[PDB]
Amino acid sequence: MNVIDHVRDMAAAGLHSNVRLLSSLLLTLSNNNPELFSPPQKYQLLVYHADSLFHDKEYRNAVSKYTMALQQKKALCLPSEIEVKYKLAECYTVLKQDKDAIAILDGIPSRQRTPKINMLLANLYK
Amino acid sequence: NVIDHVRDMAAAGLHSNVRLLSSLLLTLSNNNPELFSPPQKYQLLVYHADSLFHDKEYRNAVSKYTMALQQKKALCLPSEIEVKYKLAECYTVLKQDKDAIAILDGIPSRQRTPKINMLLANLYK
């Protein structure tokens, strides 16, 4: 297996605390040793970390990581872009930035929107 | 930070927990010999060995414990005397009496706690 695999596992088992401190350290290490991780791996790392930040309820931090993740995604069973946007939207909502929550969701092609994503939108339109 | 966190989980008694983490941290440290302070490396090792000890992997604990002491010689931190104790506990369970005795005997008498004196006494029968 692999270090990031282990972070995804720990993520699964819900050791959020651990994922946070480790992914954080991993990220620090990544900015100092580029190509210790592959671009797909970096995306994974960012999502796991942001998810972590999110569960810990530090939304502004999560927001920046999420948007960083999406940037990475632009470059070319990984976390779905659509899953990330959803949580991003959630962060914005709690932060009372609905303009921004709406934007990210609305930017998802209508045919690609999930029931969950449509609920959120619906609520936002109020 | 990180090392501090592992400490807290250990204290909390969340052992099967710290094993996974400390393990991954150890392998990382090894690959980035400059990622962690010598003092922090020591902590890691000790904490990992303890988890290896809660899970009952004594031979493996012995290894980590001895690497710990081996490191603490290059030099907050867990008592070197407490490590030596746990180390002797492993040898004992493993029935390596000679090795248990040696490590305890090697502690200056002035510094030997009741626990240690008892283990020794037991081992001397």
From Swiss-Prot, chain B:
Changing L21R: Loss of homodimerization. It comes from the Eukaryota. Belongs to the APC7 family. It is found in: Cytoplasm, Cytoskeleton; Nucleus; Cytoplasm, Cytoskeleton, Spindle. V-shaped homodimer. The mammalian APC/C is composed at least of 14 distinct subunits ANAPC1, ANAPC2, CDC27/APC3, ANAPC4, ANAPC5, CDC16/APC6, ANAPC7, CDC23/APC8, ANAPC10, ANAPC11, CDC26/APC12, ANAPC13, ANAPC15 and ANAPC16 that assemble into a complex of at least 19 chains with a combined molecular mass of around 1.2 MDa; APC/C interacts with FZR1 and FBXO5. TPR repeats lie at residues 80-113. This is Anaphase-promoting complex subunit 7. Coiled coil: none annotated. Disulfide bonds: none annotated. The gene is ANAPC7. The lineage of its organism: Eukaryota, Metazoa, Chordata, Craniata, Vertebrata. It is linked to Ferguson-Bonni neurodevelopmental syndrome: An autosomal recessive disorder characterized by global developmental delay, impaired intellectual development, and hypotonia with early motor delay. Additional features may include dysmorphic facies, mild skeletal abnormalities, and hearing loss.
